[PDB]
Amino acid sequence: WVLLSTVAAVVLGITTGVLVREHSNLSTLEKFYFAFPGEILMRMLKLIILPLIISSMITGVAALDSNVSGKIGLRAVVYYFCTTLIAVILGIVLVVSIKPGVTSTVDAMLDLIRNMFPENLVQACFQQYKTKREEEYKIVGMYSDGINVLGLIVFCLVFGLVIGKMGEKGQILVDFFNALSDATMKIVQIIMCYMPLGILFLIAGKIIEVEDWEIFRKLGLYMATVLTGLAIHSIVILPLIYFIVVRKNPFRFAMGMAQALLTALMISSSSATLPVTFRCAEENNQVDKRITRFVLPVGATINMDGTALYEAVAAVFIAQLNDLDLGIGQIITISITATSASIGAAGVPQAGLVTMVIVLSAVGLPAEDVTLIIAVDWLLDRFRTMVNVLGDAFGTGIVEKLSKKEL
Numbered sequence: 001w002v003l004l005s006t007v008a009a010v011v012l013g014i015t016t017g018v019l020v021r022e023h024s025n026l027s028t029l030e031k032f033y034f035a036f037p038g039e040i041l042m043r044m045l046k047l048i049i050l051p052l053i054i055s056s057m058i059t060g061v062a063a064l065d066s067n068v069s070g071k072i073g074l075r076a077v078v079y080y081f082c083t084t085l086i087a088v089i090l091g092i093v094l095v096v097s098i099k100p101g102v103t104s105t106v107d108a109m110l111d112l113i114r115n116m117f118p119e120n121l122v123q124a125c126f127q128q129y130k131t132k133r134e135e136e137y138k139i140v141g142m143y144s145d146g147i148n149v150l151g152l153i154v155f156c157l158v159f160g161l162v163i164g165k166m167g168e169k170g171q172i173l174v175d176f177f178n179a180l181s182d183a184t185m186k187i188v189q190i191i192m193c194y195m196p197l198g199i200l201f202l203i204a205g206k207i208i209e210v211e212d213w214e215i216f217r218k219l220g221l222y223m224a225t226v227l228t229g230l231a232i233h234s235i236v237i238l239p240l241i242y243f244i245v246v247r248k249n250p251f252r253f254a255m256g257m258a259q260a261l262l263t264a265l266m267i268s269s270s271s272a273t274l275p276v277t278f279r280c281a282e283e284n285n286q287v288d289k290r291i292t293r294f295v296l297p298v299g300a301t302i303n304m305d306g307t308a309l310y311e312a313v314a315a316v317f318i319a320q321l322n323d324l325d326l327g328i329g330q331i332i333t334i335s336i337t338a339t340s341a342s343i344g345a346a347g348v349p350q351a352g353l354v355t356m357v358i359v360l361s362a363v364g365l366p367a368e369d370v371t372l373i374i375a376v377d378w379l380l381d382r383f384r385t386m387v388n389v390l391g392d393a394f395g396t397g398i399v400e401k402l403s404k405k406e407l
């Protein structure tokens with residue numbers, strides 16, 4: 001029903017926006033009140049990211065440690081991280097070149113590392129460190145507003161690793177954050193019940209304010225940029241990696257999971273396609289059952305290459321829409337956020353919209369601009385899963401080839 005309601009809200013939002021903007025003249029103040037129901041939605045989304053990031057990173061990282069207990073385990077995880085990072089890098093390259101939403105470097109790099117190690121954990125929830133060069137030059141820093149997503153992610157990564165390996169002593173902390181992540185995901189579900197009504201007034205608000213329909217062109221280019229990046233990563237990146245590691249032909253292997261890919265276009269939930277994905281791995285291809293039953297279940301929630309490439313493109317698109325040139329340090333900041341979003345937002349379909357707010361909040365971009373992304377998300381939702389299961393495809397073959405001795 002989430003897809004049905006989101007499309008209805010987008011359709012109803014456009015109808016309301018065009019009719020309101022043509023059958024009534026609203027003041028700048030009256031346009032602000034008309035978007036209040038959607039403004040309330042946006043501050044709900046920002047309200048939940050802090051518990052979502054902390055609970056999901058600690059539970060996800062601690063879960064990964066338990067899941068992997070051998071040389072086979074680490075190779076699968078290493079592969080997953082590599083593909084997800086590559087997907088993000090490919091997306092970032094396209095936007096700067098394609099430039100859909102258009103018309104110091106040393107200090108920014110150090111600011112990145114400084115923000116990964118915040119001087120206060122409580123302030124990292126609502127403040128970020130920013131340096132400036134002044135004067136024959138001195139560097140002076142200040143704590144501007146904006147949640148420090150990098151600092152929270154890094155600490156929760158270190159904490160999750162320490163808590164996982166503490167054994168029975170840290171079990172109370174694992175249980176505490178396991179329940180916290182479960183509770184926070186139920187709150188995210190409650191927010192997604194209000195999302196259709198909030199999105200209705202946010203799409204309508206964007207329609208009313210804009211006097212030129214050229215935003216449709218920009219949004220169309222963004223749709224192409226994500227589609228171009230998703231296509232390249234599926235036929236020009238993922239196969240060669242399979243080629244390089246697995247000397248066999250990649251398109252023979254990729255052609256072998258038409259059933260899983262087709263099922264990924266019907267249910268649009270990689271977890272729901274697991275039964276088909278297993279059958280393809282054992283029946284059409286030759287991958288030992290023991291390797292597949294480890295790699296694929298983990299990849300169903302860790303390996304999300306389609307989503308990672310989509311979020312990275314969208315975040316830079318929003319920056320260009322606002323004409324805020326993305327400093328390179330910010331460009332990297334989107335890379336770790338998107339990669340860590342695989343467990344940083346619990347890797348749950350409900351948290352698909354929440355991640356963009358996290359990515360936008362990391363780089364201090366208007367979160368309200370995510371409405372244009374949500375307008376066409378449902379068009380790209382089916383295909384993002386296609387790459388996600390596709391990445392889980394080449395992992396089974398790659399990991400088995402590398403870890404053949406262990407099997």
Ligand SMILES: COCC(CCO[C@H]1CC[C@@]2(C)C(=CC[C@H]3[C@@H]4C[C@@H]5O[C@]6(CC[C@@H](C)CO6)[C@@H](C)[C@@H]5[C@@]4(C)CC[C@@H]32)C1)COC
Nearest residue numbers: 085088089092093096097326327328331332333335336339
């Ligand atoms: C405005 O864009 C700059 C513009 C266009 C140049 O094109 C691209 C050149 C490569 C470059 C700088 C670009 C985007 C992502 C950048 C990567 C983000 C990744 O993040 C990291 C760090 C975090 C790690 C998790 C791994 O990935 C780096 C290794 C990776 C990175 C810094 C490698 C270099 C990439 C832009 C020319 O500027 C004069």
Ligand SMILES: CC(C)CCC[C@@H](C)[C@H]1CC[C@H]2[C@@H]3CC=C4C[C@@H](O)CC[C@]4(C)[C@H]3CC[C@]12C
Nearest residue numbers: 113116154155157158159160161162163165166
């Ligand atoms: C964010 C980046 C820059 C930090 C990179 C530092 C790396 C080397 C740090 C970050 C997290 C650290 C891990 C955190 C927790 C544990 C559990 C402990 O029982 C053994 C050491 C071990 C496994 C640490 C090893 C060093 C480690 C991997």
Ligand code: NA
Nearest residue numbers: 080083084305
């Ligand atoms: Na990946």
Ligand code: NA
Nearest residue numbers: 303388389392
């Ligand atoms: Na996947």
